[PDB]
Scaffold this motif. Sequence first.
Motif, mmCIF file in Angstrom:
data_model
loop_
_atom_site.group_PDB
_atom_site.id
_atom_site.type_symbol
_atom_site.label_atom_id
_atom_site.label_comp_id
_atom_site.label_asym_id
_atom_site.label_seq_id
_atom_site.Cartn_x
_atom_site.Cartn_y
_atom_site.Cartn_z
ATOM 1 N N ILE A 79 1.039 -1.250 0.018
ATOM 2 C CA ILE A 79 0.260 0.073 -0.135
ATOM 3 C C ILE A 79 0.701 1.365 0.143
ATOM 4 O O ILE A 79 0.562 2.385 -0.601
ATOM 5 C CB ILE A 79 -0.982 -0.064 1.130
ATOM 6 C CG1 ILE A 79 -2.377 0.690 0.802
ATOM 7 C CG2 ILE A 79 -0.236 0.649 2.428
ATOM 8 C CD1 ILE A 79 -3.013 0.256 -0.319
ATOM 9 N N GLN A 80 2.111 1.398 0.820
ATOM 10 C CA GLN A 80 3.127 2.325 0.718
ATOM 11 C C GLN A 80 3.531 2.597 -0.679
ATOM 12 O O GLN A 80 3.571 3.457 -1.327
ATOM 13 C CB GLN A 80 3.896 2.096 1.727
ATOM 14 C CG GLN A 80 5.154 3.316 1.488
ATOM 15 C CD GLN A 80 6.106 3.074 2.751
ATOM 16 O OE1 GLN A 80 6.259 1.980 3.227
ATOM 17 N NE2 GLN A 80 7.016 4.112 2.817
ATOM 18 N N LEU A 116 2.238 1.772 -3.637
ATOM 19 C CA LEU A 116 1.006 1.995 -4.528
ATOM 20 C C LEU A 116 0.745 3.545 -4.204
ATOM 21 O O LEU A 116 0.576 4.252 -5.335
ATOM 22 C CB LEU A 116 -0.195 1.201 -4.297
ATOM 23 C CG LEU A 116 -0.168 -0.028 -5.014
ATOM 24 C CD1 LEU A 116 -0.800 -1.234 -4.154
ATOM 25 C CD2 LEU A 116 -0.482 -0.023 -6.596
ATOM 26 N N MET A 117 0.632 3.998 -2.966
ATOM 27 C CA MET A 117 0.161 5.353 -2.638
ATOM 28 C C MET A 117 1.415 6.329 -3.188
ATOM 29 O O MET A 117 1.050 7.565 -3.194
ATOM 30 C CB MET A 117 -0.170 5.559 -1.368
ATOM 31 C CG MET A 117 0.866 5.869 -0.434
ATOM 32 S SD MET A 117 -0.246 6.595 1.231
ATOM 33 C CE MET A 117 -0.971 7.845 0.285
ATOM 34 N N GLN A 118 2.678 5.687 -2.939
ATOM 35 C CA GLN A 118 3.848 6.810 -3.269
ATOM 36 C C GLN A 118 3.989 6.697 -4.785
ATOM 37 O O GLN A 118 4.514 7.739 -5.365
ATOM 38 C CB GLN A 118 5.036 6.274 -2.521
ATOM 39 C CG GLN A 118 5.223 6.561 -1.195
ATOM 40 C CD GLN A 118 6.461 6.456 -0.630
ATOM 41 O OE1 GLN A 118 7.758 6.403 -1.511
ATOM 42 N NE2 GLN A 118 6.721 6.301 0.492
ATOM 43 N N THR A 119 3.423 5.737 -5.475
ATOM 44 C CA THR A 119 3.810 5.818 -6.881
ATOM 45 C C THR A 119 2.786 6.795 -7.694
ATOM 46 O O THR A 119 3.066 7.377 -8.656
ATOM 47 C CB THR A 119 3.156 4.202 -7.351
ATOM 48 O OG1 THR A 119 4.526 3.389 -7.556
ATOM 49 C CG2 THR A 119 2.748 4.365 -8.902
ATOM 50 N N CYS A 120 1.650 6.993 -7.018
ATOM 51 C CA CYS A 120 0.867 7.973 -7.400
ATOM 52 C C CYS A 120 1.397 9.457 -7.914
ATOM 53 O O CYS A 120 2.287 10.040 -6.776
ATOM 54 C CB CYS A 120 -0.272 8.130 -6.500
ATOM 55 S SG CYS A 120 -1.538 6.977 -6.238
#
Lengths: 139, 48
Positions: free
Chosen positions: B5-6, B8-12
């Motif tokens: 999840i970290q 995925l949400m840093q990829t944004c």
Amino acid sequence: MADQLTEEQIAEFKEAFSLFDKDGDGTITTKALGTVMRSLGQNPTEAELQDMINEVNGTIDFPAFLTMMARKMKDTDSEEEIREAFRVFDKDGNGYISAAALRHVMTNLGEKLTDEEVDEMIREAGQVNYEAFVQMMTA
Amino acid sequence: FFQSIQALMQTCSVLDLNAFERQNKAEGLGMVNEDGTVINRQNGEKVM
């Protein structure tokens, strides 16, 4: 684009290339390519043929010949577009489209042109002559 | 799960001035030069 020519023109060019490259290997010599072009009615001069060869073993394949002819096709398309731009005003028969006529033509074109864009185009260049419109389109 | 999840949400991505300028300049051309329409439906917005 290599597909600038029509389907019939492309088929005729392919047939001419196949006739010139009778060996079946695809590669066609410069003299053979020139003879095929002359037989098809596109007989170019020696300087023109050299320029076309340079733009495009000592042999040129059928796709290479199509790519070389695509330049002439694009030139013909550009000439036709210039003629259409020149004759857009002459279509009405007056030969000098007025400001309202020019605005109507610009709106009918629908090339993402707004009122400000139309005004800028008119200012860049009050009836607009056909020659003036062609020159403005050429830019 | 937390690591995924970290990531995925840093990829944004975030708002970029360069990306916005590129999108505007691309949208400056309404359609293709000849025999083509630049719908740009797949491209959409270069940012977000």
